[PDB]
Structures are given as structure tokens and as C-alpha cells.
Amino acid sequence: MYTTAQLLAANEQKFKFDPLFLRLFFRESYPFTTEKVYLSQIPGLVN
Amino acid sequence: YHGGGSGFGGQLRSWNPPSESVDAALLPNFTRGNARADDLVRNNGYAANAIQLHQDHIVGSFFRLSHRPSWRYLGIGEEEARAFSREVEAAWKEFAEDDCCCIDVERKRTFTMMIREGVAMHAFNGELFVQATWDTSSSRLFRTQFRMVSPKRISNPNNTGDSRNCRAGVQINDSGAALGYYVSEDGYPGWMPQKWTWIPRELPGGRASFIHVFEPVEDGQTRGANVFYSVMEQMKMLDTLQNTQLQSAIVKAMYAATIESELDTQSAMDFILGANSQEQYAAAPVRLGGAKVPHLMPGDSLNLQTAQDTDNGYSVFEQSLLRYIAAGLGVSYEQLSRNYAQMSYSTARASANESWAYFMGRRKFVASRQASQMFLCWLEEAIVRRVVTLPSKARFSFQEARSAWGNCDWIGSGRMAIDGLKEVQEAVMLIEAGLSTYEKECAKRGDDYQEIFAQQVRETMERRAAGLKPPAWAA
Amino acid sequence: QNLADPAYRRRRIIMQNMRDEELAIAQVEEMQAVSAVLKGKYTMTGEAF
């Protein structure tokens, strides 16, 4: 009824998360232009 | 405060405006706002009159250029400075008003008229976009070409949700300074695929590739808002009211008289009005004779509708609304509405001069800015081509002294006289009192003292040769 | 050796599509004209028409 009831706080307490892997190991970005993606390597071993 | 909270017992209790930045307040419906504004200015007589007044008063028939180099700052002798000034003025007078129309790429404009185009575009869309190009054609001495592009040509590609840096087609730095634009091709016909292109604001060498001119109300306002925004609905409803009122007057006047007989329609018309005489549905055409008085029996009555006064307050109400729209647009009500009735000389002068002050301010803050930008862009090409030799004792080069060398303003149509005699009396009295200068009065009259003196000398020597009469400037 | 953006690929695809659309429209009118001044009688009909 007579319930004017002004609010004063809208606390979230929603989540706790931060990647930090985006800066730890994968600093560089490379969006594709094509679809096929090729990556390779070179092994070093000799008698 | 008391009115700040809710109002005098509720009132505006349910009205809580959404406090937000200018970009948040304009970007979400910027396209439709511009569309409504251009539609109103395109199909409304009053708005067309307003924009015409803008483009005719801000600049007018002529846009004279006057350059004063910063010789004091640059450590340059005044005689060399003014020699360079007259050289560049001659170059400008042979370039800008060239009948080639080759200053602009489309070859369909001249300098003054494209200045008018720009100021009108800013007035009715809130912003101005110009670009500079270096033509590959070697036929012309000057390879610079210009083109104004509508804001609708600049938009966020794919119309996606706006990003922090790319802001509906403009790239802003960390500090928010604009550096690049997204401009798409012409959209007529729009059924062909539409392609965008990124354009830097300026060349990395310092040349101004693109020019954005607008009045930012608040910081961070990347796109200007047209002045119509505050009055669009209140003029649209006005014109709808005018149309409906005209239609109502037509329908009220088109009936006039009625007949209440019992017989069939054709017989009643024959016996009370005339008509008939058919040679061989379409009701019946009544002969337009003169002073016809019919005879009636019981059950018959001819009733001529008294209709109604057709302007029961409509004229004064639309007058008040026109006052409102004139206040909104910043122009004088008399100019907007062709209403000079019962106006005193003093009051008409007051309104005219306050409107003139507004127009001069807008001129200085829009046309002068864009003219300076394009003038500096052309001047860079001029000095590179070395058509005019910059003085050899420059303490700073043109690259850093762009503002120093490009120190120049413009004179549009002057303060046109309301009486003429009063103004010329003021001019002559101020001159004989030493309170003003030939430059000031010739600028007020739309002239320039240098070539006016040259013309005076030429006429004087012509009269001397002719042996007719020495004019009022001798020895 | 010289690829292109799939956006440009779509652009040229649409251009070719419009071209063949125009050709298909034009041949209809040409068939109309040849039937018309070949025999005078000329009827148009087809599925769902």
C-alpha cells in the first residue's frame, strides 16, 4: 500500500574472474583471411 | 531543491530523463533524426525559407579573402610580407573563381557556392565533411580538387553496435582525437552492393586530407546535431494542422446548400433548382443563371448552410507557433514568416541586428574555419609548386608555420543597410573622428580598402586625362 | 599465390549474379519480340502462372 520505499544500494556480488592467460602466453593475434590454417615445425636431431 | 526532486505534488513525478553523454543521446537514432530533419527541410516551406536565409546571410553573394601574414612573429619585413600577400591574393583570385569549375572534382560548383553548400549542410545536418585530392591530370597548374560529402555517406560499416574507438564511422585515439573516417560509395541505386573506404583525416606529411567542421556542444561529441532536433515535431504537427485546416475549409465551403424535398432526386432538382434539359448516375448539372427563386409545397425546404468562419484563431495560433520556431532556429520571426506588420523602426532594427549578430557569429565559427582549412590545403600545394616565392629570410619553414603563413580571414555579404543614410553618416563620422578604419568600414560594406584605393587612383588619373573634373581626392 | 578477401569474393559473386540476371531478363524480351513479329499471336504461360 503506502510503500514508497526508496532504494539506496544495488550491490551485485556477481563474479570473480580474470583470464591473465591472454597476456601470459598468447600476446599476438592473427585473424584469418582464408579458412585453412597451416602451422609447422622443424625437428633438430642428428647422429 | 524543490522543483528538482518530483514537482508540486507529483506533476513530473513519472518523468526522469536518462542522464547520458551527447553521443549516447544522439547516436542510437542519429540516422532517423537526420532523415526527419532533411525531410522537413525538403518538403516544408518554412524550413526551406530558413535554410535559404542561412545560406544567403552567412556568406551571401561573395566571399572575399583577406590575408595578413604574421610578419612580426616570423621576423619578416612588412613590405616583403605584403608583397607575398598580394601575390597569394592574385593567385587565389585567379584560382578560386575560375570558370573551369575545376576547383571541385564534379566540375559543377564554384568556391562561394560550395561554401554555401557546406554551411547549409552544417546548418541542417549538424556537421560538415570536406575532402582534398591531388589530381593526376597534368593539364591544370593546380592538381588540388575538392568535394563535399554528406554525413549520410559516413557511417559505421555493417551498422553494428558502436565501438569505443570506431564511433559510427570515425576513429578516435586514446584521448578521443579523431584520426580516420569511414566513407562509403554513392547509394543511388542502393541495390548494388555498398562498399566503404577508410580515409585519414590528414596526410602524414601534414597535408589536411579531410576536413570535419561542426560545433561540439559537449566534449566527445564526434558527430554534430542539426538545430532542427528541438523543433522537428512542433513544425511537423504545424504543417499537418495547416493541411487539415485547408481541407476542412474546402469541405465546409463545398456544400453550401441542401434540399429537403420528398420527391425523387431528379424531379426535385427539376422543380426546385432547374437542370434537366438532358440531350439523351451523374446526378444533374444545374444551369448557372441568375436570381432563381423556386416554389415549394409542404415537405420541401431549401436550407443554405451558414458554414463557419474559416480562420477562427488559426492564423494567430500559427503565428505563435512561428514565433516558437523562429526562436528555435535562431532567426528573426519577421524574416522567417514574412510578417513586418505594425512593427516600429526601433524594434525592427533591434530584432534585425540581434539576428545579424547571431549570423555573424555562426559565419565566423563555421565558414571561416572551413575556409581556413581549405585555404591552407591549397596554399601548401601553391608553396610546393613555388608559384609564389616565400621570402628567403623566414625564421621558420611553412611546415611548422602553417598557421603563421595561413593567417587569413574572409568577408561575406556585409551588414546590409536598414536605412543607408544612418549607416553612411556613422561611417563618415567615425572616420572624421578617427574612431575606425577604411578596412573596418569596407568590411562592413563588403569591400576592401586596397583595391578600392587602386580603383580611386585609376578613376582619378582617367578624369585627369579626360580633363573632366578632379574628384574629391586630389594631390 | 594471390588470394583475395572473401568479402571481395562475395562482391564479385553478386556482380556476376546481377549480370546473369540481366541476361535472363533480356532474353525473355527478345523471345517476346521474335514471337510477336514472327507470327503475331503471342502467349505467355508457365508453372505457377
Curated annotation (Swiss-Prot), chain B:
Q: How is it modified after translation?
A: Proteolytically cleaved by the viral protease during capsid maturation.
Keywords, A to Z, come to: Capsid protein, DNA-binding, Viral capsid assembly, Viral genome ejection through host cell envelope, Viral genome packaging, Viral long flexible tail ejection system, Viral penetration into host cytoplasm, Viral release from host cell, Virion, Virus entry into host cell
**Does the record's keyword annotation contain DNA-binding?**
yes
| GO MF entry, a single one | DNA binding
Q: What's a GO biological-process term for it?
A: virion assembly
Q: Where in the cell is it found?
A: Virion
The record's note on quaternary structure and interaction partners says: Homododecamer. Interacts with the terminase complex composed of two small and one large terminase subunits.
Task: Give the family per the record.
Answer: Belongs to the siphoviridae portal protein family.
Record-given protein name: Portal protein B
Which organism encodes this protein? Answer: Escherichia phage lambda
The gene coding this protein: B
UniProtKB/Swiss-Prot annotation, chain C:
Localization of this protein: Virion; Host cytoplasm
Q: Which residues form the signal peptide?
A: none
Domain of life of the organism encoding this protein: Viruses
Family indicated by similarity: Belongs to the lambda phage major capsid protein family.
Its quaternary structure? Homomultimer. Interacts with FI protein.
Q: What does this protein do?
A: Assembles to form an icosahedral capsid with a T=7 symmetry. The icosahedral capsid is about 60 nm in diameter and composed of 415 major capsid proteins. The assembly is primed by the interaction between capsid assembly protease and portal dodecamer, and major capsid proteins assemble cooperatively to form the procapsid with the help of capsid scaffolding protein. Major capsid protein forms hexons and pentons of the icosahedron. Viral genomic DNA is packaged into the procapsid through the portal vertex.
> What is the designated name of this protein?
Major capsid protein
Q: Which organism is it from?
A: Escherichia phage lambda
- Indicate the span of the full protein covered: 99 to 147 of 341
